[PDB]
Amino acid sequence: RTIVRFNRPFLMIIVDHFTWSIFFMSKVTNPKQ
Amino acid sequence: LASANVDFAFSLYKQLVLKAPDKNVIFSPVSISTALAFLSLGAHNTTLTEILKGLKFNLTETSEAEIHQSFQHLLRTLNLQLSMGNAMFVKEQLSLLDRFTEDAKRLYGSEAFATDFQDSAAAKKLINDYVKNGTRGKITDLIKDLDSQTMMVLVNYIFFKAKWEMPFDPQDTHQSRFYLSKKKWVMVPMMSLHHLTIPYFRDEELSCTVVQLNYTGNASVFFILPDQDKMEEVEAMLSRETLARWGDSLEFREIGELYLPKFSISRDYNLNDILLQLGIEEAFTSKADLSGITGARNLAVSQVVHKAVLDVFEEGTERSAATAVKITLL
Numbered sequence: 606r607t608i609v610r611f612n613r614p615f616l617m618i619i620v621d622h623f624t625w626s627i628f629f630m631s632k633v634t635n636p637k638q
Numbered sequence: 639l640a641s642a643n644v645d646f647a648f649s650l651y652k653q654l655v656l657k658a659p660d661k662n663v664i665f666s667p668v669s670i671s672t673a674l675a676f677l678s679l680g681a682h683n684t685t686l687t688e689i690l691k692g693l694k695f696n697l698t699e700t701s702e703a704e705i706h707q708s709f710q711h712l713l714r715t716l717n718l719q720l721s722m723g724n725a726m727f728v729k730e731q732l733s734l735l736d737r738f739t740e741d742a743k744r745l746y747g748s749e750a751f752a753t754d755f756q757d758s759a760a761a762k763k764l765i766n767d768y769v770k771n772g773t774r775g776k777i778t779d780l781i782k783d784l785d786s787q788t789m790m791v792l793v794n795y796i797f798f799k800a801k802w803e804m805p806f807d808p809q810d811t812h813q814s815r816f817y818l819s820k821k822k823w824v825m826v827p828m829m830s831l832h833h834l835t836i837p838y839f840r841d842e843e844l845s846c847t848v849v850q851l852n853y854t855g856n857a858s859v860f861f862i863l864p865d866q867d868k869m870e871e872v873e874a875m876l877s878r879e880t881l882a883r884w885g886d887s888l889e890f891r892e893i894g895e896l897y898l899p900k901f902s903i904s905r906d907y908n909l910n911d912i913l914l915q916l917g918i919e920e921a922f923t924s925k926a927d928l929s930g931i932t933g934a935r936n937l938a939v940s941q942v943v944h945k946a947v948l949d950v951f952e953e954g955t956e957r958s959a960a961t962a963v964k965i966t967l968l
């Protein structure tokens with residue numbers, strides 16, 4: 606069984622398919638600022 | 639152009655992390671590059687070349703017309719809820735070239751709002767209300783302070799609200815640990831999905847796992863999960879080549895359980911030092927050449943600011959950002 610657990614720092618990237626521009630990017634180091 | 643925007647996004651990201659290595663990051667590369675490309679409509683000589691090279695365009699291969707048309711088409715691509723707007727707020731007595739105001743409307747969709755910056759609280763409220771409207775209330779305080787001698791402010795906003803293709807059930811959200819480091823955690827609402835089949839790649843060389851979660855319609859989010867204590871090493875590998883390799887390596891995999899926090903984060907930035915590190919220098923100096931705005935070399939950038947907000951929850955996500963370029967007399 607494969608488990609994916611985002612319980613430590615992670616990145617997200619929103620890549621637009623129409624242009625391949627990056628609309629948003631984030632690093633989550635601590636969800637509770 | 640794709641290459642430019644990806645190269646720019648990762649170059650900017652790396653500078654943000656260097657400046658504040660212990661903070662969350664949320665930003666919009668496209669908001670920043672659109673605001674700076676808008677500014678460049680009015681730039682000449684070294685001021686211009688530094689902006690466009692700072693945005694990672696290759697000026698031997700790409701003309702200014704190709705660059706501005708790429709932002710015009712991108713603006714059409716943006717306008718699931720997705721919107722982007724541009725505006726210029728201008729001292730009413732400032733003389734502007736017709737080419738600048740016409741090109742700003744045609745290419746960037748920007749109106750010119752006459753603004754009395756000497757009544758600085760009213761000017762600040764107008765700009766902030768413009769951004770609040772564009773971001774559906776999510777960014778209310780883009781502008782914290784506004785000098786009474788401001789001549790022009792260029793503003794971009796972006797708003798993106800989307801529903802997950804496979805939404806989380808709130809009944810499966812439970813308080814769980816999020817490890818800040820090997821030894822310390824915070825408790826967070828941890829959402830979960832079960833028995834899903836999604837694009838997945840375990841990158842053993844880079845000590846990270848990458849997955850894609852889809853929204854409805856035609857959007858998705860790329861997730862990168864470094865092994866514990868490998869975030870900095872993954873960050874150093876961010877590049878167009880790495881992103882393309884990850885994309886080319888994804889394969890559908892059955893995932894028994896996926897856990898994702900429910901959370902919101904926001905960040906506010908002064909981008910002056912960031913943009914200088916990218917090579918955008920003359921625009922801030924007494925040698926600034928923004929003579930395409932007025933016809934005279936009489937304007938310089940004082941500050942570039944950016945704010946962004948990210949909300950992740952069971953039904954979907956919301957992302958918003960805005961950028962402002964403040965300009966004074968020389």
Ligand SMILES: [Ca+2]
Nearest residue numbers: 698699700701
């Ligand atoms: Ca060419």
Ligand SMILES: [Ca+2]
Nearest residue numbers: 845846865866
């Ligand atoms: Ca490992």
Ligand SMILES: [Ca+2]
Nearest residue numbers: 867868870871
């Ligand atoms: Ca390390």
Ligand SMILES: [Cl-]
Nearest residue numbers: 617629630631
């Ligand atoms: Cl993001």
Ligand SMILES: [Cl-]
Nearest residue numbers: 781782783943
């Ligand atoms: Cl401010």
Ligand SMILES: [Cl-]
Nearest residue numbers: 844845865868
């Ligand atoms: Cl390792």
